[PDB]
Design a binder for this molecule. Structure first.
Ligand SMILES: *[C@@H]1O[C@H](CO)[C@H](O)[C@H](O[C@@H]2O[C@H](CO)[C@@H](O[C@@H]3O[C@H](CS(=O)(=O)O)[C@H](O)[C@H](O[C@H]4O[C@H](CO[C@H]5O[C@H](CO)[C@@H](O)[C@H](O)[C@@H]5O)[C@@H](O)[C@H](O[C@H]5O[C@H](CO)[C@@H](O)[C@H](O)[C@@H]5O)[C@@H]4O)[C@H]3O[C@@H]3O[C@H]([C@H](O)CO)[C@H](O)[C@H](O)[C@H]3O)[C@H](O)[C@H]2O)[C@H]1O
Lengths: 68, 68
């Protein structure tokens, strides 16, 4: 009797460890993305205005997505 | 006479112990199953909506079986 019952208990424990491991991995598998951008920019500053002129960029992006 | 009668009584007792043991074992031999699942999930949160996008999963499961 007892060696089979001990085996059933060890299977039950194994499933909870595997379920625990899955929640540990979730802390690694997020928030990685390609955020690199590169632009040819020139600028001139005066007592009233900053002028900004763009010559090229790595990608086309919305002017609302850029913070100054 | 008496050694045979004593033997018949011990057989009767033995059956009730075996029947008792069978009901003890029934508390072990249930409720063990493979419950592990694992998914590639990404999400974005706003003042009005949560977006959830799934990239892969360990198995195909009903959206009614998942609790949020
Ligand atoms: C999962 O997989 C999916 C599918 O591939 C997606 O890839 C998802 O990624 C998310 O997608 C959503 C939806 O595309 C993204 O939400 C958008 O976020 C942008 C910000 S961003 O910097 O431009 O990238 C915008 O906020 C966009 O909103 C648009 O709609 C706004 C509201 O317009 C709605 O209502 C008007 C009426 O008032 C309607 O006429 C119109 O048709 C529409 O229904 C606009 O205001 C907005 O304009 C400006 O928005 C931002 C400032 O907020 C600015 O930066 C922009 O340049 C632009 O000038 C823009 O046109 C979001 O889209 C969703 O739109 C719904 C709407 O119901 C239509 O479906 C909501 O109302 C919200 O507006 C918004 O959720 C999200 O960023 C991605 O992560 C993957 O995760």
């Amino acid at each position: 009797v007892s060696p089979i019952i001990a085996t059933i208990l060890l299977i039950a424990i194994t499933v909870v460890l595997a379920a625990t491991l899955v929640t540990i991995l979730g802390g690694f598998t997020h928030g990685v993305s390609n955020t690199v951008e590169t632009a040819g920019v020139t600028s001139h500053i005066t007592s009233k205005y900053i002028f900004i002129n763009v010559s090229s960029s790595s990608s086309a992006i919305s002017a609302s997505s850029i913070t100054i």
